[PDB]
Structures are given as structure tokens and as C-alpha cells.
Give the backbone structure.
Amino acid sequence: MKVWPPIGKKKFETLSYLPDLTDVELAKEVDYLLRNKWIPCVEFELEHGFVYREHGNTPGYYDGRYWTMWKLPLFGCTDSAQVLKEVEECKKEYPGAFIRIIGFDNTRQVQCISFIAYKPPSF
Amino acid sequence: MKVWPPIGKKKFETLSYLPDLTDVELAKEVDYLLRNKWIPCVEFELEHGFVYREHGNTPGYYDGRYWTMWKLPLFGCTDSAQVLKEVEECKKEYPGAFIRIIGFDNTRQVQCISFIAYKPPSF
Amino acid sequence: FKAGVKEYKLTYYTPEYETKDTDILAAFRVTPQPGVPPEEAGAAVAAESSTGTWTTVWTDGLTSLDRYKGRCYHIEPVPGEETQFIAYVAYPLDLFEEGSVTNMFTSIVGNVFGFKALAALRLEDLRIPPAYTKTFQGPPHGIQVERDKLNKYGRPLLGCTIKPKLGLSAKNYGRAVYECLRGGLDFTKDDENVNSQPFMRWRDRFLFCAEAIYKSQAETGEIKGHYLNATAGTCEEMIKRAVFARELGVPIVMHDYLTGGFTANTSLSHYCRDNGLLLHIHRAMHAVIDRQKNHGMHFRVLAKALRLSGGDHIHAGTVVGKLEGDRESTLGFVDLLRDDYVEKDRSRGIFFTQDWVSLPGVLPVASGGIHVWHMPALTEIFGDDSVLQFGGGTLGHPWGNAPGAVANRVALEACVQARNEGRDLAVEGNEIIREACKWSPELAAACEVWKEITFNFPTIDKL
Amino acid sequence: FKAGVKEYKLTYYTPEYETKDTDILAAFRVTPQPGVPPEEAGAAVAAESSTGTWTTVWTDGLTSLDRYKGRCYHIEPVPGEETQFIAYVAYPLDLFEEGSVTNMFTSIVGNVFGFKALAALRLEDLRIPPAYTKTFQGPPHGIQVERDKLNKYGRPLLGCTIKPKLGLSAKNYGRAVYECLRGGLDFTKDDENVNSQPFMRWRDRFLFCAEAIYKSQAETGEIKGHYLNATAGTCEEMIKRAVFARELGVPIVMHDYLTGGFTANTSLSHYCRDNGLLLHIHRAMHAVIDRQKNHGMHFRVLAKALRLSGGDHIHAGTVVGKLEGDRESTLGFVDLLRDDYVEKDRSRGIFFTQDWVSLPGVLPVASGGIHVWHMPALTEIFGDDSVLQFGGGTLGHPWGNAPGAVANRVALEACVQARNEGRDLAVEGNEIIREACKWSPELAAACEVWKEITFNFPTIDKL
Ligand SMILES: O=C(O)[C@@](O)(COP(=O)(O)O)[C@H](O)[C@H](O)COP(=O)(O)O
Ligand SMILES: O=C(O)[C@@](O)(COP(=O)(O)O)[C@H](O)[C@H](O)COP(=O)(O)O
Ligand SMILES: [Mg+2]
Ligand SMILES: [Mg+2]
């Protein structure tokens, strides 16, 4: 038996139990998002990488769920490279930020995909 | 079609929708009581021949349910004529009274039979 | 701890077990799939209704399966079936939440009926131990208290479902109730599906039915009731309805315990005990569960469950009316509803001896497709501690509700006096009814209408 | 008015009727007794589930049967079946109490299943019109809200029933919950029959489970839940338990909607809407009702009734696991649970087109006898909007709960990426799993234990 570490294993929701994705693997996730007609959007965070409770504690209330939006959603986008270009541009201005890619279905109005694309060196 | 009278048809629970019992039929019901090992008792009433609500009106509360006990239940008596003698004693002492015969099952503590035996001239 | 799948019978088939006096016992009619031996089928039913799942879990070692596991302790074949068998399962007392029929069913019938390895499954009976029975209030009042509150002794009670089932207004409902009650019925009732609806809202109906109860009681001199339906979409709506019945001072409400459900029904039963209201239970939905012989739950299981959760009446079938009711099976569960102690009697489907430790008894209610000509058989089947209900048999009389009620009341009292004087209701019933028509033109008119009406069909659920 | 019995078909068989867009529609699988015509059997079902009884009542003339009666409007013989047919019944909107599943079932399935003249009866589907749907709250939150509250996107959620079913102490329950959640599961849960019992009282369990939720959430950085069971014997106890879960600030509770009942479930659904609690619904007892093809109610009817009464999850079967669930029927009622509009499609058991008029969607939960090798098939059947639950499949891992949770999480995410990069889960599933064993030891240990475990038996309820 091997024991699952109780430290140093902080997670990032979907895909974060797999080894870190490669840039082609990140591009292929964007490809899947676009093939499903979802709207891609980049979000980034510099201070609270994980959910916390500071301002409330009632059922279903947490802090740290909202990140900051990077520009706007790429409506009518057709290139996963354009999404990765904004991740690189965000990486360059905020190298200490976590950065994630999300995807919206505007008919159901639900984010149908979400995965981290960059983690800062402080992590 | 015949219309059921809405007046002049006051009733007295079990058997009161049949023709009045003869003295042989009254005794026949007393025989049934005794055959079942029930213990008979006579009750009579001079003022409230029917249930009413004077002292309360909550669910399951009514006045006029208790009548007055004639003597005591005839424990160990197994002759119908003894019971009917008690009706006769009651009826001569209280000719203006309603008089009924009841029978208890003491294992279940349920009155298993009850029927009118005399109704006063005022009725 | 050894990880992996093993057979349930290695842990849950214990044919050597002796049931404890605190165990809840269950008798299951099991039809396993081809290739599945009865020992394994029975052990899977015991395992997955108590402590077990499909693979070995290490957490078993933190407690004691010995004290907690359900156990299939006996397996007996079914005469006339090649694969089907009865499996007897014993459940420790600690498995169950006190006072909760909901929890008891959740274990015993929660998941096992859907196992792929079983082709069919039916719970036939349960043995409820005294140590579990004493955790339940049971009926708010019960047979003895009900007769005493209403001052009614010596004969079955008489009731009647207002018809048409749906579509009547509140004022027309109270009109029908008054005319029925004043003719000699002790009760009338909302149909099971009369709750609150566009054609008639509940509060309006309650108000007019109260006017009818008290008018008919003042007229006749006999205590009257009308089962006011508390069944509702939410517990809050259900309780609101009962509170208004309480305000009105009336004696009896009703609940559809299966469609409302056991959690709600137990709440209402407690309310009725707290406020002195009789509680008539309608078994709507039961035949979805209890009709077929090979799968489901027998009504005697649902009847015991109602006695535990609580109700003063429960419908028990007619045998001879429009809904199915096997005679010997019905006599069995009528005893289980009324009596303090019922010995095992497989000839009447009673799989286990059942001690009720003075839990109050429930009045069985015979209702559905019955009329005056049925009175001798009903009186003979059920005896004095029952309610006989004539909806169509009252509102279908050619002279109206009051003469229909008189016909039914005369027909019943004729049977009582005949039986009390020695006549056999089971053989002289038509004579008894016929002879009573002489001085009762009302009964005569009902006899003419329904003389050739009988309900004889193949019995689906035979003993 | 003419007293006496008529055939039901004279009033209630109306094959020319045109259904209205406000009607509730029902498809019944009817098996009449020998000698009973389908038109009369179908009229009897329509009559005794709406306005009629066994004999003509004069009160019909006070109202309008034309506007209130249910109508058997169509008869559809069943192929390969001599006497069995589908009967189609339309019920006017006014028959039903707004917001009350209890009332809807009381009419449609109340008495008709016990009729002597029928040998068997099953309700297969119902068409709920938008005019009645809008009287229901439905789920307290629904799929979109739940994912938003939990911050979980792009994959199925993962759950796990703590085991053994019964017998664990409160402290030991919380220990298992912590070790499960910290390994990558989103949820754990009380077993359906874990309520409050001598071996573990509910309030102690809720307290220690809260400690485990917050410890594992702090450790992993992901929002965690444990379904705390509010099922109880009375509505008062049920609400008490939900109030304490609200005090603790936890995200999700659960309820056994069938053993608790619809009246209690609707009350709990409203409470959860009022207080922001997700409500996982366990379908304990459903197979008593839904297993056999000839009698009962199909699960799709029970699933629609839950979506009306209210729940954020409901168990919907696995297809591949230990409990029965036909694949095509399951695909049909999963759509009925999740989607806003579902077109009629008998190939998936959908008898009526169902419009949900924006009522929230319910997350289907696949649970029971599933393990790591089933992950590709489960992901393929249900897609991202599901909960896949592994009780024995986690607490059965040879290294314990955290490695067991890691195995399930890794397998799931490996299926997701493989799918998202264009692979065929239905054909490459086993190779996808073997590739992940290459870098996940936790998954490798799980695959070795369960490699040869499948559940394949003849399906009882087929289309
Ligand atoms: O809806 C009905 O049909 C009834 O009102 C009877 O009406 P009628 O008196 O007009 O027949 C009763 O609720 C049924 O007897 C219930 O069935 P059961 O007692 O078997 O549960
Ligand atoms: O009691 C059980 O068996 C479970 O906890 C599963 O345990 P495992 O995960 O250990 O198998 C679930 O409640 C069943 O899946 C319910 O069945 P369904 O989902 O069909 O309603
Ligand atoms: Mg009815
Ligand atoms: Mg479970």
C-alpha cells in the first residue's frame, strides 16, 4: 500500500488528477470546446488560488469562486491558437497568477468545460 | 319516490330503524349478550334523551353520552328474566325515563351491545 | 482485510441461526434468476437490506457484523414452483430507527427488489417485535376509544363516499352529506382524490360539511361524522387542513397514507392524538404494490405498517365487491389489524405470530361496489368491529341519498337482529333482506335495482 | 336519472376525443380478465380514476361530466400479446390539486389497480401539461445552479456510499468520509437506511461529517459535500435534521422520497429552496413498484413525479451494475430528467412528448455495483451531467478510502480527456483505462481487484 499525501496535493477541478497537460493537450481541450460551439474565456487569479470562506458561511456560499476575467469571451472564435495566445498574453503580464480556460453554452447558460492552463512559480 | 321525514324520526342507535322489539325479542337480545359471556347493565335517563353540546365543543366531546346507572352490572347473572325485571323496576320507579340495556366485554373493556328497552310517554 | 468480491452466502446465509425475541423477521417470496442458487439469492437479500454491499469493505472490521448483519436463516420451497422459494431473514433491533416505518421499509424493501440476480421478489410478512412496537404511538385512538367517543355499540358502522368522485361544488357536497347522514349513515367521506381543486376548494368544503354534520345530527339524534380529507401536497398544507377540522369541532378526518406517505402520515397521526381527532386511513395506491403474487408487498405488510404509523380506520376490502380481496387472506389481516395477538396461521397467510403489546386496534373498512344484498355476507365476514361503506350504493338509490341511507341502515340492523337471534347470515342472507322489505319500502327499492349485481372474477392473489 | 348499473364504456370510452393542451395524459398497460372487452376495461380505468363509480348516481346532474370526466380516448393492442393493450386516458386540468404529486397519483393510480375485472395494470407514462407543471416548484436548484454553487464543470461528479450500510459509529462515519473526500471524490453519502439508530444517532453523525467535509475541502482545495440524510419517521424530525445541516453551513442533504413519501418530500424540497441546500434524492422502494413489465408503474413515471415534487439529484441506475436498468429505457428517462423538451420516442419508452417549461433539470445518479472498469461505459451513457457513485468501489480498494477515491477520480478524468481528444469510449474504453494504470498506481491496484467482475442477467423490464 501507498499512502495518499495529505500535503502538497492541492487540486484544480477537472483534469487536475492527471499529469500536467501539454500545450498540444491544452490546445486539444480548446478544440473540443470549440467543436461543441462553446464560447471560450480566460480567467486569472493572483491572491486566492483556492476556495475559502471569509465573508459568509451559509449553505452553498463560498469565497474565491469568482476569478477575474481576462478581457472578454471570444464570441465567434474559431482558433484554439487565439485562445492560447490570450493565455500567453495573460501569463506575461501576470506571471504570479493562476490562469484557467472555461467554456460557455449560451443556450443552457452553463459553463460546460473548465481547466487550468498555468500555475505560478509561487505554487 | 317517498320522502324520508325530516322530523318525528329521532333515533336510538342500534336496532332503532327496525320495528319496536317485543318483550320476547328484547329478551332474545339479552340471551345473545349472555351467550357471548358479556355482562349486562341497565341505564336510564330523565332529562337528555339525546346527545347535545352545552359544556364543550371540541372534537370527540359531546354531552348526554352518559346515562344514569340502574343499580350495578349483573355480574354472574345469566338469566334474561333478571335483566328484564330490572327494566321493569326502573320503568315503574321512573315512568318518564328512557331505558336501555348494555353489555360489556371485560377482557376488551368494550361495550359490545346496547339497545333501547323502554321509551317514556312524553316521547 | 482481503479486497475483492465474494459470495454473500459466506456471511449472510446462516441456516443455523435462532431468531431473537428482539429481531424483526421477514418472509420473502424470492424468484432467483436461472443459475442463481437459493442460498445465494437469500443471502443477497439479507445482505443488501442490512449491512452488505457487492465487494468486501475494510470498514467491516471497525464494528461487528456479528451483532448487526441481517441473516437469511431459513429457505423453504414453494409448492407449485420450481425455482421460487420463501427466504426468512432476521434483522437485529439496532438496525431500525425507533418509531419510523419509513426507516423500516427503507432497509427491508429499499434496494433488493431491483437486483439483477433476482427475477422477482415479494415481501409476504413481517414479525414486529414488542421492543420495536413500543417505539410507536400507533392509532390515535383505536376501536375501543372510537366506539366510546361516538357512543356507538353493537353493529358495524355505516359510511358512504360522496359521488361523483370529482366535480361537485362545496355547497353540493354538503347537500349530499346532509341527505346521506340524516338517513341513518354514521359517516360520509370525501373521495380519496377530493383534496382541494378548482371545482371545490377544501376550506369551503369543510365549512359546508360541518353545517351538514350538525344539521343531520340534530335531526337524527345520533352522532355523525364526515371524513374531511387532510391529504395534501405538503406537510404544512396537510396540518392546516386538520387544524381547521379541529376548529370546527368535528370528530373525524382522513388521510391517504400511501400517496401522502409514511413520514406525513405519522405526523398527522400524532396531531390527531394530540387533538382528539379520529383518523380514517385510505389505502390509495396499495394495489400498485400488492396485487401480484410474484412481486411486490402483500397488503398484510402494508396493514401492519399503517397500524404502527397510526390510523383509527383502514380500508380492508370487501371480498364480494368491485375490488379484489381473497376471503381467507382478508380474515387473516383483519385479525392482524384488530387483535392484540395473532398466532401463525399459514392457511390465512399469517407467516409469523404477531404480538401487538396493547397497541390499539384498527377498524377495518369494507368499501367498493357493495350494496344491500351484500349486507349479510359483509356482516358475516367482518363482524361488529368494521365500517361498511356504500357510495354508489347510497347515491345510486332511485329515491335519493336519505332513502338510500335508510335502505342500508335497515339492511344492516336486520342482519344484526337475525344473527343475534340465531340465524346463520352465511346461508339465510337473502331471506333476511327479503323479509325486511315488507315494512321498509326504502330497502325494497334498493333490492329491485341491484338484485342481479355481483362481482365474480378470477382471484389474482390466492393463498 | 335512471338508477342501476351501466357499462362504463357508455360514458368513459370516447375514442373520438381530441386531447387538449391542458390535459394530463396517461398510458396504461392493461391486461383485462378473460371475457372483458378492452373498450370496457379501458373505460373502467378512466371512470374510477376520475369521476365514476360502479352504479349510476343522481348527483351527476348537479355538475358536468362532460367537463370533468376522464376519457379513454384510444386503445392500442400490444404485439405478440393476445388481450393486453395500451389504454390512453385524458384527465382535465381541473381534476388535480395544484402543486400536489400526492393528489395526481391518488387519482391516476389510487384504486384502479385492484379492480376484479383486470388481471394486471401498469402505468407506463404521463403527459404533464405546462398548465400543471407551472404549479410546482420542482428541483430546489437544478443542474445549472448546482454546478455554479459547487464550482464544478466539465466532467461527471463522483460520489460514494459509506459502508457497511449500518453498524458504523458517528466518529467512524466521519473518518471514512474524510478519507474518501480527500482522495478526489466530490461527495460521499449516508446510506439510504442510515437515519438515526442505536449504533449512531443522527446529530452526532452530522457533526463529525461536517468536520470531515471541511478538513477534506481545506486539504484538496475543492468544494466537498456529504449527503446528510433527512429521512425520518415524522415531518418534524425530517425538518429538524435539515435545520441542523443548514446550521452547519454544509452544501447538500438527501431524502428517501418514496419511503418518506411525496407529502414530506415536497415540504423538504421547499425548505431546501428556502435555505440554499442541495437535495439528493434516493429512490429506495422504487423497484417494489417498477420492476415487472405487466403491473406497477414504470420508473419514468416515478422520475417525472420527483422532478415535479423536487430534487436536485435522483438515482437513475447504472445499466452495467448490480441493479437492473435497461439501456434504452434509461436513456429515455434520463432525458426526461435533464432536458427542457423531450420528443415522443417509443424506441426509448417515451409515450408522450414532454415539455418541461423551464422547470430545473435533475442530475441523474448512477450508483450500485460499479467500479473503475465501468468508467468508460458510464461516461459514455450519461455524459458530463451525472453523478457516478462508488461505495464498495472505494471502500473496497486494497489501500483504503483515499487511494480508492484517487483510482475513481483518475479513471474518470482519463475517460474525459480521451473523449475530448476524439477517442471512442465505447470501443477504446479498456485501453484508455490500461494507459492510466501506467502512471497511477492507485488506479492499477483498483483494476487488478475488479478485473473480472461484471453483472449480466436477463433483463426483466424491456421495451
Ligand atoms: O373510490 C371508490 O371507489 C370508493 O369511494 C368506493 O366507492 P363506491 O362505494 O361507490 O364503490 C372507495 O374509496 C374504494 O372502495 C376504495 O377501495 P378499497 O376500499 O378497496 O381500498
Ligand atoms: O445501498 C446501495 O447499494 C448503494 O449505496 C450502492 O452501494 P455500492 O456503491 O457499494 O454498490 C446505493 O444506494 C444503490 O446504488 C441504490 O440503488 P439505485 O441507484 O439503483 O437506486
Ligand atoms: Mg373513493
Ligand atoms: Mg445505499
